[PDB]
Amino acid sequence: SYTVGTYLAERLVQIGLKHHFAVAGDYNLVLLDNLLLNKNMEQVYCCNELNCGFSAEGYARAKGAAAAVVTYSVGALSAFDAIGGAYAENLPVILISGAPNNNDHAAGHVLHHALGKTDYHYQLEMAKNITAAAEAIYTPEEAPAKIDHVIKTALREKKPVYLEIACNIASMPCAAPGPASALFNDEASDEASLNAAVEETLKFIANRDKVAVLVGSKLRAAGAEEAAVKFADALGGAVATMAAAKSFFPEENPHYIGTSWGEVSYPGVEKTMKEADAVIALAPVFNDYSTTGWTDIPDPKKLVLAEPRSVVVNGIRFPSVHLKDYLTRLAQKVSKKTGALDFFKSLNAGELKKAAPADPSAPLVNAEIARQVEALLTPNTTVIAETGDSWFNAQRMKLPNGARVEYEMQWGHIGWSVPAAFGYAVGAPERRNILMVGDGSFQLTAQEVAQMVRLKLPVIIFLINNYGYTIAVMIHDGPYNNIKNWDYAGLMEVFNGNGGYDSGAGKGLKAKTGGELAEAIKVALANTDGPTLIECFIGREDCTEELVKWGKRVAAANSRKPVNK
Amino acid sequence: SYTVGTYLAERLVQIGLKHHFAVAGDYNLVLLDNLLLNKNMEQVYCCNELNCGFSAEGYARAKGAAAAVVTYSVGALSAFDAIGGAYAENLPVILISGAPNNNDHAAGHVLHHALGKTDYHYQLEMAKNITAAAEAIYTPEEAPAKIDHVIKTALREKKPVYLEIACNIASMPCAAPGPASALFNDEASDEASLNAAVEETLKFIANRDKVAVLVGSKLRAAGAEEAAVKFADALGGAVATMAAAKSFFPEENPHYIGTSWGEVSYPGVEKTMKEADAVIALAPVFNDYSTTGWTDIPDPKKLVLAEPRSVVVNGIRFPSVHLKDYLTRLAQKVSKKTGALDFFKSLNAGELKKAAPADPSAPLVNAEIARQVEALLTPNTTVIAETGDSWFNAQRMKLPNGARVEYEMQWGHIGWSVPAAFGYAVGAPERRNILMVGDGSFQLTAQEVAQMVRLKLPVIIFLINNYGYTIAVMIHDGPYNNIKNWDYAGLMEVFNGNGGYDSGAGKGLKAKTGGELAEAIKVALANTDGPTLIECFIGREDCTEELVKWGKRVAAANSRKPVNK
Amino acid sequence: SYTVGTYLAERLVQIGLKHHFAVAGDYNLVLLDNLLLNKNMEQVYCCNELNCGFSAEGYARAKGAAAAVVTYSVGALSAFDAIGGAYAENLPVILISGAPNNNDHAAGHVLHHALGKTDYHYQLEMAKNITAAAEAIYTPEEAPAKIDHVIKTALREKKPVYLEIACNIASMPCAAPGPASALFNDEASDEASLNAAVEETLKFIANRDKVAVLVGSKLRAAGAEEAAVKFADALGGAVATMAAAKSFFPEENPHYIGTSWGEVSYPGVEKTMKEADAVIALAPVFNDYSTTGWTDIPDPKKLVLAEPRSVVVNGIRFPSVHLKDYLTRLAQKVSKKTGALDFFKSLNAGELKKAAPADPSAPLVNAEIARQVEALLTPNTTVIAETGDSWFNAQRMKLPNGARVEYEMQWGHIGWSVPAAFGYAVGAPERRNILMVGDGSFQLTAQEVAQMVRLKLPVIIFLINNYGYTIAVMIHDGPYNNIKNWDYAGLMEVFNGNGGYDSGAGKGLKAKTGGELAEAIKVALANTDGPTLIECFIGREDCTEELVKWGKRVAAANSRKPVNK
Ligand SMILES: Cc1ncc(C[n+]2csc(CCOP(=O)(O)OP(=O)(O)O)c2C)c(N)n1
Ligand SMILES: Cc1ncc(C[n+]2csc(CCOP(=O)(O)OP(=O)(O)O)c2C)c(N)n1
Ligand SMILES: Cc1ncc(C[n+]2csc(CCOP(=O)(O)OP(=O)(O)O)c2C)c(N)n1
Ligand SMILES: [Mg+2]
Ligand SMILES: [Mg+2]
Ligand SMILES: [Mg+2]
Ligand code: NI
């Protein structure tokens, strides 16, 4: 039969989870015990609750959904930062929090781990601000509906949700869960709306032969990646990805012209976007970063805006239309509109200029690092790129079909990448998992590398030691951009603890030249029993020219003076 | 003149801050530039925002107030956890957050670091649940009043507060601040009430010779420690401390009888408390941990409750009576009530039983560690004691007058002790600052030690490596109590980074015998240029006797089934 | 083309509104101008915002949805009470509030009608607590998505929603709305779940022969009234209505046995429910009133709980199964379960005892009022029954098929009935609309009768003048149950204002005997050009027997002492 804990466990298993992440606390131990009863799913422990949140976030990037289990108050509050991130990056992370004994409610009881008042709903009220659904379970009878509600909502909305469970009811009997299919049940497109949206689009591009497609960072959340490819092949138009949509469209496809990102776009892309008479944006996010300081905004008179669940085209809004249906039907009706792609080719702007192989003995530079990492890409590779110049190194890489890049470009939490890489590697252990992270970001969440060691995850970490917050240096410089330098390579043996209670097979290596990097990479690819950190030493001013151009824009936008109102 | 930024800086300097803590972000960079302009204060940088909040918390325990500065969303949300802790521990920490350009407001703008919607009041709305005041500054004209409001509230209520500042107004001119005294202005005790409360207190104990005094954990926040010593000397009664009130009363005062903590009370203290005719609780916090699972609750018909700003005595409640004034006035009128103390001493229940110095060559045991640590205790010494068995090692120690213990027993966030020690040492560098932390807790926030090395703080760290969450093992045991063991001593040289971009003078030593421990403690004292981590190895089962007894009652309280209603 | 305002009006028209209700204020004037441009809809003006909210609520009962427009703060806050009522009664009311000029945002601007602070999100934040969706529109670009989102949520959830619109963008251009069918697009039942829930129900009642069906008060919201009689006819079991579900099932269907309401159930009904071995609860709301002070809770070991969007049966919970689809499939496969119906008939409990026609010249008594009112009931009739003895008067009436009763038994706001009857009459002017209201309730919202006069609505108002709050006198008597008597009949000539600026055709009559009432009812049916209020005079202690029995049990529940720990 079922308890509150094993009901939740079963639902998690039904939406496809093979792992859930947890930090033990006295308010969730019984719950953890009940989750553990389901041998179809593994309990993975993290160091702190922030890393736990980002671990699940990364896991959801690999498997589509995730779960994090923390304790009441002291656990959940730091996790909220990760949950906020999951929301911003449209990932269904289910955050489960232990909660006080339900006898301690409306009793006038001060409780440990809480604020010192007799109020026990402040955590729920906080969570409401950063989740698609949030529920507290204080009795077993209400458990099944609340669990089903939040899990259904997360999958439908592609947003994180919140659950708290009284510690003394986690083992209480409750109803059994029905079929898994009920959890994914969602409304189909309104047929009439779907047909009118497609027809309006054909009317719009009837005498606009220069059609460009702009791939956006919500395309995976809409499950519309495959459909985008059918539509593009049918259209024969020019296809560019927004920066945060890297790898959301096959780069070996003949219609792909590269990255669209204002003045830091691939060669010929900015001109082509300007020359197109119609722009079809598939699930874009336009914010201050993606529009390069509000300098690159799509011409509203040319824009066909196709969101996950609605289309605006030809001055008409069509709610209740799923992007994948709209793309699939459109791909069946559309004729060739090659004008944009023909214009792009007529530019002869050439491929992205990339640096030649560096002299192996010469001092290591950022370009030489990017070159060697790119050479590691395969159809089975995933690169995790941290906020920082790593954003731009990654954007410059040509991806073979199948290879993935993971960005956190809406939330932008430095340190996200380390736990996110951990969780991703747990979720997709069969892939070659590469983490590109700067020294500054790495310090926020570095202990999660020890969990990589613990689970023998062969993550390859390229640690860019440029000695400071360089991306911040290119926005606005000051003494707050300086940090304490670590011996990052030596940190691996610390996490191994060889000679201690347990063991580890992680390796840490330093690279000061192109030759030393190449040797380290060879060692990394041979390490199958643990992660390999490659500490790369480069100058502080040595970064992509993209970062410098983009940095000026961002700084000017942020700092622009108030307008009288 | 003054700007929004330099206005804030001046107010912080006026309330006695000599440092503030910060994590740079593109929404607070200009704010940070302005704070720097005031050289009467130093800007201290932290690894992540959680740590930064706890550093401010620790700093507040040393200086009486503190400030932390983070960036919007990604910074603030994780720091909320520390702020909640400051609320629970009655510490005026001022959290200042950068916020979006004020032109981005109601403009329909999606921004980096936000949830992907177009509204920016969720952070503030969350903040309101865990602060005594929360204000957003969107224009220069509003800044002074809002800054003054939150700071006055923080100091008066002894609670943390929240301020956010639009990033494009930090350098905007505003009014100059007035005299610092205005920030400490607080109401006096209502004279009529003060007198009535004291009189009612005299009537209540007129025929109750066995009066016992219970020192609670809000005593310092009430600024009433000195007045308690005066009242006690006048009463000549028996004085015991609650667990969290350790060092809030002089332990070599002839009226001090030890710790009152249910069945884990000092010898005879429990009997003396149950034998008393009248218990005078000074600023007590009665939660589930402090009452040992609701087993040791004060007798309601013996209790005089003297909270920080009110007194309940003899069935009458007297608001607007400051604890400090109450005790001082009471000290002038009270007569001798020695019965409880007389009863205590007759019991012949000897002093706390401590083990004799172990064989310096034999394997290290918990008792021995606590022995040498106690021998380091000095009137100049502060012990920061982490959640876990460190709580009880510290509770068992006799403190010379002047010696301080710092507990986070209401919030009980593990990992707190590391950044807290950092911030405390920054705020009290002349003191001998000792940190007693478990291996499990250390892993959550270990990177902040790197900041101890950076500022050359001679903190002495006793890391108790028993390989896991032993305290949780004594509440409810499971696989979630196990962790990845590190080489913690080796971590120090990683943080030093000698041979890298910079240097550090921290030391990492291992201690496995009572003898190895003794030599390490010598090396640690000899190290004045940085922190010293002493990794002590002991078994998992090797904990204090108190932890086990106490843990069972706590586990029982948390697990008790519901009652029909 | 469309403005923010005309976009809203078209969507309201599309979901089936022929009227919207409004109160003018300087923050919604231009919005009201834009709504008026759509001729397919009339704009109806109310006295105050509370009544305007309750008129929309009534309208929604008649037409399935409604909209109310009010001004910022002073209008909205009062209307929030009505909106909470719509949430409680599962009625999709759309509350649209004017809001400040969008230039006044984050400008440090104090505005009339607001709290005197400089921030303007408190009204939204409040609204979130009592709606299924709540959006603020500050720019014309975001309007269509937000308007579409709140309306679709309201229709899907059957709950009220909230919209505010900046007063200076109501005339601003925006996209055009797509096809109306988009707004009703909902998910279908999960086929595997639907079939599994059908089977589990069949297995559960395999040898549970005495099957009873309990019609609950959310059956209309679930759109499942028709599917309920299909199921009922197939099963051949006994069907009882919960008090609040009166008229949600055909009372001359051969399976109907009457009201199930504890010790005030119809004769035989209570014994039938106890005797049954299976109870099929259809969309029930079990609260303290419907369970008669928790004295009548359905046996959990025999309950099939079929909610609007889920089913719990045989220990298994089936989300994603619509009640309509569930009952329809069930009717196709279920076999005869007559046992409970056989049991009911064998009881020979007889019909509900009803008084014979009194002597016309004798003093009026409650039963005679209910008799004559019952005699007016027709297939074209709707009774609006106010909180108080009217509840039980209406509950006792036999309804011809077609006749409806409207209750507000979840929210229970006295005074609801007057505005509610107004909106209902506006939305169903063809029907015989009868309002049964106590003198106590009438005084709260009496002015809305003047609007009945204004639109010439032939509402028949029975005003039970027993001089006070009789229902509360039976709960717990005190001086707070006495009121100031009015001349309720003469109030009609006041609202007519004949001889003034306009005219009115309302009539007010007094009835002190059975015959006087008979005579007044005839002139009421004659009056086609306006409402007719009949002021009936009865004693304070002259109420239904059910009221006292029910009242005692309710007062017991609410006053019961607290539980220990
Ligand atoms: C939690 C959090 N705190 C602060 C920031 C602000 N921030 C953005 S980039 C950055 C610097 C990143 O440093 P590093 O990892 O060294 O990147 P790189 O030097 O390669 O640019 C900072 C502090 C953030 N994005 N998230
Ligand atoms: C953030 C947070 N997560 C979980 C807990 C619950 N908790 C209390 S003590 C503890 C174990 C502490 O481990 P350690 O530092 O090794 O203490 P020791 O084993 O010496 O008792 C945990 C997980 C907590 N207090 N705070
Ligand atoms: C706004 C509001 N205030 C108070 C109540 C509580 N209440 C319930 S019944 C009642 C008295 C109703 O008086 P009346 O309409 O004369 O009913 P009757 O005497 O006919 O039973 C009151 C005050 C309520 N339901 N709603
Ligand atoms: Mg860096
Ligand atoms: Mg431990
Ligand atoms: Mg009455
Ligand atoms: Ni605003």
Side-chain angles (χ1 to χ4, degrees), chain B residues 362-427:
Chain B
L364 179 63
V365 293
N366 171 76
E368 184 56 39
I369 292 185
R371 197 189 61 76
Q372 304 192 38
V373 172
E374 192 171 353
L376 289 177
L377 255 44
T378 254
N380 190 40
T381 303
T382 292
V383 169
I384 310 316
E386 184 60 277
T387 297
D389 198 27
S390 288
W391 271 358
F392 299 86
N393 284 321
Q395 199 68 194
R396 294 173 45 79
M397 287 159 51
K398 179 182 57 182
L399 311 171
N401 289 0
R404 303 308 304 249
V405 170
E406 294 292 347
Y407 279 143
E408 200 203 31
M409 275 184 58
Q410 172 64 41
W411 199 235
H413 190 299
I414 66 169
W416 156 90
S417 71
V418 176
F422 167 63
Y424 184 92
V426 162

Side-chain angles (χ1 to χ4, degrees), chain A residues 176 178 181-182 185 188 190 315 317 320 565, chain C residues 105 148 176 181-182 185 188 190 315 320:
Chain A
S181 58
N185 204 64
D190 181 54
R317 179 162 203 275
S320 307
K565 30 158 52 190
Chain C
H105 269 286
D148 288 350
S181 56
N185 197 47
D190 181 50
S320 305

Side-chain angles (χ1 to χ4, degrees), chain A residues 439-440 464 466 468-470:
Chain A
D439 54 337
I464 315 301
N466 54 19
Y469 300 154
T470 287

Side-chain angles (χ1 to χ4, degrees), chain A residues 448-467:
Chain A
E448 216 56 13
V449 175
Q451 308 297 358
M452 298 180 186
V453 177
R454 192 182 183 175
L455 310 192
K456 301 185 172 185
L457 303 183
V459 181
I460 301 176
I461 315 179
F462 296 98
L463 184 290
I464 315 301
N465 197 348
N466 54 19
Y467 195 45

Side-chain angles (χ1 to χ4, degrees), chain B residues 105-106 120-121 138, chain C residues 105-106 120-121 138:
Chain B
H105 216 47
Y120 299 98
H121 65 266
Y138 303 116
Chain C
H105 269 286
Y120 299 98
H121 304 293
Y138 307 115

Side-chain angles (χ1 to χ4, degrees), chain A residues 33 112 288 411 476 502 560, chain B residues 33 104 112-113 288 467 476:
Chain A
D33 286 349
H112 79 283
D288 56 326
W411 196 234
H476 192 98
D502 49 30
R560 73 194 190 271
Chain B
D33 289 328
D104 290 334
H112 76 289
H113 292 344
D288 54 318
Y467 199 24
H476 194 93

